[PDB]
């Protein structure tokens, strides 16, 4: 106490509690996982329905930054739509200045330097968000990135954001990555959301899957959800 | 032109241990005089004067801006100003107004504040400092003053013959000019004293 008010002051051992407080605000949020196959990235976000409380398809946390770039935000939803506008605005200036599609290595670095800049001053607070960046290209393959509220951004094959962070990634690494098509990954994501988060605190919940890769021609779009409905039928087979 | 709007003639000649400066005494507007006592030589310390010629607005404007900057220089230091430091000071003030300039051409003629060494220089309207060893002139009737001082200058000149020389250089060159005249004042300064004389010229 006394050192944990401003984001500019240091602790007497040398850390910043305003960043430490914002990270566990992201921890108190529902689970969103991501995993890439050999030719694409598959997103999966658990979505909570309290009783009715909204439509069927409101406030979806699977945003769409560029034609070939996705989001899997989790945490404080209001600041997530702020980062989604900053990443949207960043990718247009790369298009206007240079004339081709933004590489994901830049787009993680350009956003993380904006997240880092809100951890230096007493005027502003750090963002209470964390998110995923998934892309696919014919000259760079698929990449999957991950940004914390501090600003540390580097690569992964499979990551998880939410309450069930360490509990869900235990069985993500039980899967294989190179020898899987992303059509197989879609029904593999659907069981991980279904295994974790038992219907005790939250009875009803949704399951939104988004997917970019070689089958989607590099364009990012949502999976056909009402069409063919193979996610939840294969996921509920794990009853024992 | 703009330099010929009022007229003027400033001459400075270097002697042996003394320097002399001279100017005319006319204020007019292109054909019509107004007075006979328009000051064109302003003192800057002791044994160091400055002459100005050209547009009569920029004569009185630069002579007050330079006096503004000179008193601040002499109070932030203790000493008086050297003649080289004045020439660098004026050349800054004329170059700041690079695009819309002051239509004037200064002439500096003084002595050393330490020794008795004379100094003469003249500047352009945008501030190109030009030092000589014999004489500098400025004004509308410039070419007549070059015809005087080339045939009427000797290296080592006592203050008696220095006064008799710059007087004949001014009284013959200015009486050939149309927009200059109406009296000539001559300052002859040296280490001991300062002598100011007004000549007897054609009043037409």
């Amino acid at each position: 106490t006394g050192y944990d008010l401003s984001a500019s002051t240091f602790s007497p051992d040398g850390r910043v509690f305003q960043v430490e407080y914002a990270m566990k605000a992201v921890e108190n949020s529902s689970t969103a996982i991501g995993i890439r196959c050999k030719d694409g990235v598959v997103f999966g976000v658990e979505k909570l329905v309290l009783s009715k409380l909204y439509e069927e398809g409101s406030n979806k946390r699977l945003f769409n930054v560029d034609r070939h770039v996705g989001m899997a935000v989790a945490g404080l939803l209001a600041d997530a739509r702020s980062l989604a506008d900053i990443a949207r605005e960043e990718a247009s200036n790369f298009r206007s200045n240079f004339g081709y599609n933004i590489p994901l290595k830049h787009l993680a670095d350009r956003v993380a330097m904006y997240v880092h800049a809100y951890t230096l001053y007493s005027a502003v607070r750090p963002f209470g968000c964390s998110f995923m960046l998934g892309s696919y290209s014919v000259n760079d393959g698929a990449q999957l990135y991950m940004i914390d509220p501090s600003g540390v951004s580097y690569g992964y094959w499979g990551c998880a954001i939410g309450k069930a962070r360490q509990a869900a990634k235990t069985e993500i690494e039980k899967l294989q990555m190179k020898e899987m098509t992303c059509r197989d990954i879609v029904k593999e994501v659907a069981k991980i959301i279904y295994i974790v988060h038992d219907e005790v605190k939250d009875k009803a919940f949704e399951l939104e899957l988004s997917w970019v890769g070689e089958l989607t021609n590099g364009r990012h779009e949502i999976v056909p959800k009402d069409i063919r409905e193979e996610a939840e039928k294969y996921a509920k087979e794990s009853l024992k | 032109s703009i330099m010929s709007y009022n007229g003027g003639a400033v001459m400075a000649m270097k002697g042996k241990n003394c320097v002399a400066i001279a100017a005319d005494r006319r204020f007019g507007i292109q054909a019509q005089m107004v007075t006979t006592d328009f000051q064109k030589i302003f003192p800057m310390g002791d044994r160091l004067y400055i002459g100005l010629a050209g547009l009569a607005t920029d004569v009185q404007t630069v002579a007050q801006r330079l006096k503004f900057r000179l008193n601040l220089y002499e109070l932030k230091e203790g000493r008086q100003i050297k003649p080289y430091t004045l020439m660098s000071m004026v050349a800054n003030l004329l170059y700041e107004k690079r695009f819309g300039p002051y239509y004037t051409e200064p002439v500096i003629a003084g002595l050393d504040p330490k020794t008795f060494k004379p100094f003469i220089c003249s500047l352009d309207l945008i501030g190109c400092p030009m030092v000589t060893d014999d004489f500098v002139v400025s004004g509308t009737c410039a070419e007549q003053m070059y015809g005087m001082c080339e045939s009427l200058w000797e290296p080592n000149m006592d203050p008696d013959h220095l006064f008799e020389t710059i007087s004949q250089a001014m009284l013959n060159a200015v009486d050939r000019d149309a927009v200059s005249g109406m009296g000539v004042i001559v300052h002859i300064i040296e280490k001991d004293k300062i002598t100011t004389r007004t000549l007897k010229a054609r009043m037409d």
Binding site: - | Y84, T85, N92
Partner: protein, 232 residues
């Protein structure tokens, strides 16, 4: 920023400025130095050590030139020194672009300290933690001045700053007479430099710069090692 600009240095109810008195405490816990004026040149002598044998002494310099004839050292802290050196480098050029003449040593210290006083009254910043010793031979007579974090300026003959300055102050009060030569001044600046130095005085433990009437001249470690024989 926001636009705060509120002064954090106010008057005590006793009637003193507290933060400037604390900035002088950081100066006294610095490296010792000694500057002696001796009627033909001024000698600046600092005490430069390394924490280990791993450093490189040909990298960071103490006795620093300003224009061509104006030297400058310090006794406060390290990183605040390089700011007001670069400030004084640029500030000596606007004198030369206007007056076309090298700046007198009395004229920099009026201007460096006026930067430094106004720096303390302004808000949101701390004062500097560096005292200076500015010297130079202009118009025949040499000069030797001292600034402070309050922004005041003085004119010494033989002073000392840094650690154990009161021991060097009584030593220079007895050793330094009214006038010497430059070579007598270097001999007595080293004879007061290791009042509180270590045992070894090599060419890398000290670093001495002089101001002749020919100009500022920083001594290379060859002549420092050649003069340190039979020193004091």
């Amino acid at each position: 920023e926001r636009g705060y600009s509120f002064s954090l240095t106010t008057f005590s109810p006793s009637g003193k400025l507290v933060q400037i008195e604390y900035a002088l405490a950081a100066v006294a816990g610095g490296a010792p130095s000694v500057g002696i004026k001796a009627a033909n040149g001024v000698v600046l002598a600092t005490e430069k050590k390394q924490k280990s044998i791993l450093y490189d002494e040909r990298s960071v310099h103490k006795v620093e030139p300003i224009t061509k004839h104006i030297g400058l050292v310090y006794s406060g802290m390290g990183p605040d020194y390089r700011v007001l050196v670069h400030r004084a480098r640029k500030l000596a050029q606007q004198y030369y672009l206007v007056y076309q003449e090298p700046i007198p040593t009395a004229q920099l210290v009026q201007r460096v300290a006026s930067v430094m006083q106004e720096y303390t009254q302004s808000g949101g910043v701390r004062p500097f933690g560096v005292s200076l010793l500015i010297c130079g031979w202009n118009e025949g007579r040499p000069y030797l001045f001292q600034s402070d974090p309050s922004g005041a300026y003085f004119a010494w003959k033989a002073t000392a700053m840094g650690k154990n300055y009161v021991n060097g102050k009584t030593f220079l009060e007895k050793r330094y007479n009214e006038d010497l030569e430059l070579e007598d001044a270097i001999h007595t600046a080293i004879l007061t430099l290791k009042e509180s130095f270590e045992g070894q005085m090599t060419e890398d433990n000290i670093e001495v710069g002089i101001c002749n009437e020919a100009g500022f001249r920083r001594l290379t470690p060859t002549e420092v090692k050649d003069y340190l024989a039979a020193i004091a």
